[model samples]
Target: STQLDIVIVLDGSNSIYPWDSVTAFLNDLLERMDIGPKQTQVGIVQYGENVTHEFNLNKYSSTEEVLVAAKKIVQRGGRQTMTALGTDTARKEAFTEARGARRGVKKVMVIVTDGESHDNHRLKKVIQDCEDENIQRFSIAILGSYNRGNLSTEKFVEEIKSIASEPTEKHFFNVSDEIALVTIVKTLGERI
Candidate 1:
């Protein structure tokens, strides 16, 4: 089986209403993978005002175990969207060998978020750190809240695009709303 280590970075800020959509997307994506200890190991890190490790890559050895744990994840709500700190923690803590990361295995990060980040100033350096560690990134931006308020999503889209790896067309995704996120699950699964 192919060796891959995937870390899902979730934005758990209060603005992301009806968190069920996020968990559903995760289950859909994970269902498509050949998950196992030697296959595609997965981890989850959620962030809002602070970051929390939902599970490590090696926490569960089978897809069923991973799915069960994923379903139990509750939203860790906060007022601020600290995206930079989230990714930075994923790079510095979650991806380490101590956390089941393996050498020579492809490292992937899937960042799912809505709204603009409060720590945008630190994103550039934080992203650079992930790149230095050879972590390929895929960013998804949810525009439902913005559209509801009749707000422009220009900056939000741009921020997520920058977070994605090269060839933004493949690495970045933007959905009109939370429910619309399901539309890209197949494509994102194929990309990984």
Candidate 2:
């Protein structure tokens, strides 16, 4: 398997629903990766009012270990969906070389969001920092409906596209439902 450092940032806001969908999506995604410290290190950060560092890249070294840890993540629900803060948290806390992020390897961040971010303007700079570190971001904007909160679908899609890596098709995704999430992960796994 190829080597890579990846972090999955999930939105844990109250607006997203049963929250079971997020975990189910994560379980499927984890099962698809070549997880290991030396192969593809994976970490997950979930955000609502606070960020939950479920596991770091260095914490697990085998496929089984990663799968088990991913299943253990608990919901940290809040009214706010601070997507920018979640991305920033992952970049700072999860992708460190000391945290199992290998230098000269692909550093990728998969952000799963349901729109309505608390901080929009500040997020651009946070995203730029990820790019500065050579992290290829793949933003997944999950909208099971046209509108979820105060945010509009057009603006939500626009924000997600803006935060993604250049050449949007390969690095950005807009899933109308949870089942489409698997396709996003499959495409990314194959690409990486």
> In terms of lDDT, which candidate is strongest?
1
What's the C-alpha lDDT at position 1 in model 1? 47
- Over 95-178, each residue of candidate 2 has an lDDT whose tens digit, in order, gives 887767787788989888877588887788999899899889988888864454434688888889988898988888888765
Which residue segments of model 2 deviate by more than 4 Å? Answer: 145-151
The TM-score values for the models, in the order shown, are 0.98, 0.90
Clashing pairs in 1: none
What TM-score would candidate 2 get against the native? 0.90
C-alpha-based local distance difference test score of model 2: 0.80
- lDDT per model vs. reference: 0.93, 0.80
How far does residue 15 in candidate 1 sit from its true spot (Å)? 1.4
Worst 10 residues of 1 by lDDT: 13-22
Candidate 1 lDDT over residue span 51-164, tens digit each: 999999888889988888989999998999999999999999989999999888999999999989999999999999899989999999999989998999999999999999
**RMSD for each of the candidates:** 0.9, 2.0
